[PDB]
Amino acid sequence: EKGIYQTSNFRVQPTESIVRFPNVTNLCPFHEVFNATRFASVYAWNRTRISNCVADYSVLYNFAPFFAFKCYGVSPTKLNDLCFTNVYADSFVIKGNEVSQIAPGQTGNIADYNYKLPDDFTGCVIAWNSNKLDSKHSGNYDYWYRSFRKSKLKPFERDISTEIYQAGNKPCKGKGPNCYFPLQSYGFRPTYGVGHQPYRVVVLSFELLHAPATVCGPKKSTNLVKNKCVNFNFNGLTGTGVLTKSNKKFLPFQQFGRDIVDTTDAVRDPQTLEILDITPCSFGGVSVITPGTNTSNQVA
Amino acid sequence: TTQSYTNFTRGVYYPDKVFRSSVLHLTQDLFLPFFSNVTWFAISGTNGTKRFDNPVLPFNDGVYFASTEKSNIIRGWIFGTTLDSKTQSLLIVNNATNVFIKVCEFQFCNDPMESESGVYSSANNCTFEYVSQPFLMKNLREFVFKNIDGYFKIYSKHTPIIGRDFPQGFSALEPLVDLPIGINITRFQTLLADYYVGYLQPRTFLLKYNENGTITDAVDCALDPLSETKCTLKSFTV
Amino acid sequence: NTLVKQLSSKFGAISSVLNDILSRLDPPEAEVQIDRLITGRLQSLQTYVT
Amino acid sequence: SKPSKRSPIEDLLFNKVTLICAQKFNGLT
Ligand SMILES: *[C@@H]1O[C@H](CO)[C@@H](O[C@@H]2O[C@H](CO)[C@@H](O)[C@H](O)[C@H]2NC(C)=O)[C@H](O)[C@H]1NC(C)=O
Ligand SMILES: *[C@@H]1O[C@H](CO)[C@@H](O)[C@H](O)[C@H]1NC(C)=O
Ligand SMILES: *[C@@H]1O[C@H](CO)[C@@H](O)[C@H](O)[C@H]1NC(C)=O
Ligand SMILES: *[C@@H]1O[C@H](CO)[C@@H](O)[C@H](O)[C@H]1NC(C)=O
Ligand SMILES: *[C@@H]1O[C@H](CO)[C@@H](O)[C@H](O)[C@H]1NC(C)=O
Ligand SMILES: *[C@@H]1O[C@H](CO)[C@@H](O)[C@H](O)[C@H]1NC(C)=O
Numbered sequence: 001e002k003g004i005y006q007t008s009n010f011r012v013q014p015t016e017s018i019v020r021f022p023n024v025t026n027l028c029p030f031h032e033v034f035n036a037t038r039f040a041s042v043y044a045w046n047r048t049r050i051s052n053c054v055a056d057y058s059v060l061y062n063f064a065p066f067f068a069f070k071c072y073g074v075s076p077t078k079l080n081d082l083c084f085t086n087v088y089a090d091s092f093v094i095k096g097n098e099v100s101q102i103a104p105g106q107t108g109n110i111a112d113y114n115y116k117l118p119d120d121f122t123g124c125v126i127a128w129n130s131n132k133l134d135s136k137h138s139g140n141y142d143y144w145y146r147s148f149r150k151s152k153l154k155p156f157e158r159d160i161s162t163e164i165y166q167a168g169n170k171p172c173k174g175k176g177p178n179c180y181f182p183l184q185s186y187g188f189r190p191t192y193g194v195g196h197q198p199y200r201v202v203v204l205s206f207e208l209l210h211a212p213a214t215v216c217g218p219k220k221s222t223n224l225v226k227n228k229c230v231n232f233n234f235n236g237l238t239g240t241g242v243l244t245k246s247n248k249k250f251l252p253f254q255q256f257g258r259d260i261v262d263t264t265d266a267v268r269d270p271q272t273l274e275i276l277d278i279t280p281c282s283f284g285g286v287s288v289i290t291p292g293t294n295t296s297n298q299v300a
Numbered sequence: 301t302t303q304s305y306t307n308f309t310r311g312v313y314y315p316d317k318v319f320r321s322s323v324l325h326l327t328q329d330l331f332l333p334f335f336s337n338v339t340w341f342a343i344s345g346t347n348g349t350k351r352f353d354n355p356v357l358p359f360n361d362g363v364y365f366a367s368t369e370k371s372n373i374i375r376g377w378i379f380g381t382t383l384d385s386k387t388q389s390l391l392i393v394n395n396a397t398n399v400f401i402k403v404c405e406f407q408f409c410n411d412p413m414e415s416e417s418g419v420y421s422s423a424n425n426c427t428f429e430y431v432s433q434p435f436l437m438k439n440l441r442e443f444v445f446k447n448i449d450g451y452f453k454i455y456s457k458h459t460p461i462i463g464r465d466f467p468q469g470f471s472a473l474e475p476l477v478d479l480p481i482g483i484n485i486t487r488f489q490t491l492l493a494d495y496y497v498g499y500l501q502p503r504t505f506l507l508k509y510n511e512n513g514t515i516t517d518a519v520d521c522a523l524d525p526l527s528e529t530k531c532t533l534k535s536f537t538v
Numbered sequence: 539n540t541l542v543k544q545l546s547s548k549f550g551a552i553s554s555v556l557n558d559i560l561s562r563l564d565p566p567e568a569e570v571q572i573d574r575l576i577t578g579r580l581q582s583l584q585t586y587v588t
Numbered sequence: 589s590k591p592s593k594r595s596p597i598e599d600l601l602f603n604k605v606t607l608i609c610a611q612k613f614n615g616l617t
Contacts, residue, residue, distance in 0.1 A: 049480060073552065075564045082562060086480070207449075208562070211317050238557045249512045250319050253475050257319035257513075260611060261539070262546040266319060284617060542612045 002292035012281040014240050017231040018224060021083070021216045022270040028053035028215060033089045034063045034126075039134075039200050041144035042114040043183060044160045045092035055084065056218040064128045067199055068099060073122030074206065083216035083236035086207040090115070090156075093134060093142050095186075097195040099127050102203065113146040118155035123205040131190055131197035139187025142198065147184050156205075211235075211255035224269065229281040234267045239278070246275040301346055305337035308498060310466070311364040312505065312518045313444055313455040313473040319513040324534050326521075327507065330446060330500035332364040334520035338498035343373075345495065352410045356383060356489045362446035362500035368465045369494050370438055372396075373414070376491040377445070379452075381484050384408055385422050390452065390483050393491065396437040401430040403481050412493035428481060435476060438462070444473055445488075446500065452481040465494065472515035506531045541586045549578030 028050050040046035057079045069076055094102070094110060101108040104121040111117075117125075134142050148165040168178020188198060213235045224243065231240050237256070246266050248257055257266030257275075266277050289300040311332030332338070339357070343349040357363075359379065367374050380389030385407035392401050404427065406420035435443070435456060444455040455473040508517040521531035529538050548554045551574040552562075559571045590599065 047482070074562050075567075077564070078562060236561070238561055248319060248321065251474060251513055253314070254317050254319040254513055256317070260323055261542045261614075263614070280613065283615075539612065541616065542614055545614065 002290060002295070004287050004289045006285055006287050008286050009283065010286050011283045012229050014229050014231045014281070016225065016228075017233070018222050018243075019219050019233040020224065020270050021219050021221050021235065024052060024054060024216070026053045027059075028055050028087075030055075030057070030059050030089075031063065033091055034060065034200075034202055036091060036200075039091055039093040039130075039142065041142065042092040042094045042110060042201075043144050043146040044158065045090050045115055047158075048089045048091065050087040050089060051214045053215055054218050055087065055215050056080065060126065066126060066128050067096075068125060068127040070103070071124040072104060073208065074124065076124065079124075080217040081219065082206075082208065083213045084206045084208050085210060085213045087215055088205045090203040090205065091201070093130065093198050093200055095143070095195070096129070096197055096199050099199055099201070102127070102201060109145060109147065112152050113149045114153075116153045116155045116157070117203070121155075121205070122208055123203060125201070125203050127199050127201045129194075129197060130200040131192075134198040134200075135188045135190040135192065137189055139189075141185065143186040143188065144183050145186070146182070148180065148182065208236075221271070224272075226276075235270055237264065237267065239264065241281060242279040243276045244279060246277040248275055248277070250275050301342045301348070303340045303342055306340055306466070306496075307335055308332060308338040308364075308466070308496070309334040309520075310366075310442065310471075311444060311473075311498065311500070312470070312507070312515060314475065314515060315507075317475070320509045321511055321513055323509045324536070325507045325509065326504060326531060326534060328502065328504040330362050330448075331503045331505055331520070332444075332498045332500055333503055334518075334523050336498055338364065338496050341490075341495040341497065343369075343494075344492055352412070354490055354492055356487050357497055358499075359445075359447070359485045359488050360499045361502075362444065362448075363488065364442075364444055364496075364498035364500060366440060366442040366466075366496040367494060368440055368461055372437065373492045374490060374495065375436065377488060378406070378411065378491060379445075379447075379483065379485045379488040381486045383487060383489055385424065388425075388427060388483055390481055390485070391420060392435070394434050394436045396434055399432050399435045401428075401432075401477075401479060402426065403428045403483055411489075411491055414493040417493075428479075430479060432477065440466075442471075442473060443476075444500070447481075447483070447485050450480055450482045452479045452483065452485075453477075454479070466496075470515075470517055472518075504531065506534065506536070508536060541582060544579065544582040547578060548575075550574045 033048050074082065092115060098108065098110045101111040102125050104117050104119050134140060148167060150166065162182035164173060164182055165180040167180060170178045172179040188196060216235060226243050226245065229242050232238065232243065248266055250257065250268065255268045256264060259265045264278060266275055268275055291298065315327050315329045341355065344351060345355055347353045376391065376393035378389060378391055381387045383389055385405050387405065388403060389406045390403040391406055404423045405425045407422040409417065409419045411417065411419040438461040440459050440461055442457050446453040453475060454477045456476045457471055457473040459471055504521045506519040506521060507515050510516050517536060519527050519530045519536065521527055530536055546554050551559065551571045553559055556572065556575060559568050563571065594602065
């Protein structure tokens with residue numbers, strides 16, 4: 001019928017994709033952490049900070065096949081596209097039967113007294129069977145478990161102060177009914193079954209939140225283009241828009257800017273330290289003016 | 301020699317590195333409450349200008365610290381759980397050329413004509429060292445020390461002291477440094493050879509941003525019925 | 539302002555930004571987080587229109 | 589003598605109460 005109708009919407013599409021990452025050519029020391037001479041006892045796990053590097057995770061697949069590689073807050077295959085603010089590697093060796101406890105929300109001897117993950121956990125749990133390196137016919141000192149604790153552990157709370165069990169109803173120093181050596185050692189032989197053989201575990205905790213980041217995946221930078229509708233990725237922050245010179249006076253501390261409705265409207269370029277405004281690409285509704293198809297097929 | 305707790309309405313800092321302008325932003329974080337009891341320590345507080353035994357005060361959630369002395373007697377802070385060689389401790393010192401931040405199992409030595417002492421000789425099992433420009437060097441020299449998720453966040457602002465040691469003008473602190481120390485802190489001690497120590501609490505504040513990314517005022521939403529009204533309406537005028 | 543402000547809410551999702559959900563997760567998980575955002579945003583539009 | 593040809597009172601009425609708005613332009617027009 002004759003009239004004006006609203007049909008679909010129009011959008012200006014981007015013409016190119018611009019990705020900007022900092023001047024970092026240093027590789028992350030994942031091989032030093034995974035290819036350890038020795039792994040820390042689970043009761044006293046070794047936390048290694050990873051910073052100022054490219055988190056190229058292909059080296060992890062080069063290191064070993066894996067028993068378990070389960071990511072909770074991220075995809076295991078998109079880790080090289082992401083950029084992380086703070087990455088920590090918790091390295092320890094545990095009994096295979098306890099591997100299922102290295103997960104958010106779990107309980108058991110390890111989740112309760114040696115190493116606990118928070119419920120709000122973003123990261124990856126990586127494990128492999130290390131029997132050929134850690135088991136010995138005479139036993140070893142790699143396995144230590146804090147069987148008894150006055151209270152359960154909080155996530156990432158390390159406590160290596162050992163005294164004596166308070167299992168009984170009387171204070172004592174080693175009395176067998178009421179007191180046991182606070183930290184137990186266990187000996188393992190290469191002939192033990194799959195559930196008793198040692199496994200090497202590395203937990204990668206990723207604070208994948210907010211503006212700062214020291215470690216970005218292996219992306220290749222491109223040139224900047226201003227005053228055009230483009231796709232972009234700034235240190236993991238992605239979107240579509242027009243990048244223009246900004247007149248906002250950001251403090252050296254401030255890195256991103258936001259509007260009154262908490263949307264991103266400015267970024268700092270990781271190499272130039274230029275502040276760029278983000279303008280959305282033009283969009284709007286499309287209306288069609290029709291004389292009516294019983295008169296003419298011309299439309300505006 | 302502790303004195304009156306005074307009436308501080310200071311200690312507001314930029315909660316994160318996000319630029320905002322002409323925005324009244326309501327946020328919840330750890331802040332020094334307005335009209336809070338800030339203990340004022342009284343050269344050297346209890347020991348006095350020439351005595352040992354400077355006090356060790358709790359570190360409850362976080363600490364607001366300020367010093368108005370131009371004597372340059374205060375040069376650092378020591379933080380930890382025991383402040384003894386056995387328990388990992390964090391040492392921050394200023395030699396007026398660099399700021400030295402080290403965390404090790406430093407020993408206590410009654411750490412102080414104001415000569416340098418052989419303090420923390422047994423610096424065993426060192427975990428982290430950082431060196432940068434001096435933090436400290438008639439200047440208010442205000443600092444906030446917060447310790448969350450392993451990050452010892454230090455914020456500060458240095459403004460002139462002209463008419464008042466603690467003028468009523470508002471000035472927000474900007475983060476100066478953010479360190480991944482990974483240290484558990486229960487107690488701390490000041491290092492000497494007008495020190496105001498307050499405590500941060502979870503609070504919601506309405507922060508007023510300028511045309512530029514500068515915070516010019518703030519409302520403590522739990523202080524007064526009027527402050528709740530200001531926060532509820534997202535306005536400084538009711 | 540309320541309708542726009544609702545876009546920053548998570549509604550139980552890991553993140554309020556749709557591009558971050560797609561950037562971080564594989565389709566099977568992204569669909570769950572996205573459905574949470576769709577439910578919240580669609581409910582917000584119906585409230586606005588009513 | 590004034591653009592828009594409004595009366596003095598209409599001009600007052602128009603001045604007391606307060607075309608692309610960048611704010612809120614997230615699909616809402
Ligand atoms: C915001 O920052 C600017 C500097 O970036 C301040 O300085 C004024 O900026 C305007 C810009 O048009 C100039 O016309 C003035 O001459 C500048 N003044 C001075 C003294 O340099 C500006 O004052 C700051 N805004 C506020 C509200 O403090
Ligand atoms: C990794 O460990 C193996 C153990 O046999 C050693 O031969 C290899 O050189 C190590 N590689 C690195 C990069 O440390
Ligand atoms: C623990 O981590 C540190 C830092 O990466 C490293 O030097 C040390 O050798 C590691 N030890 C063990 C037992 O993994
Ligand atoms: C990165 O390298 C380029 C080389 O031209 C240099 O101009 C730029 O300042 C560097 N940026 C940083 C952040 O180091
Ligand atoms: C209260 O604030 C005023 C501000 O001028 C100050 O002079 C006064 O000393 C403060 N109160 C106390 C108890 O010190
Ligand atoms: C603070 O000190 C107490 C002293 O008993 C200690 O138990 C507590 O664990 C310490 N704080 C932290 C965060 O570890």
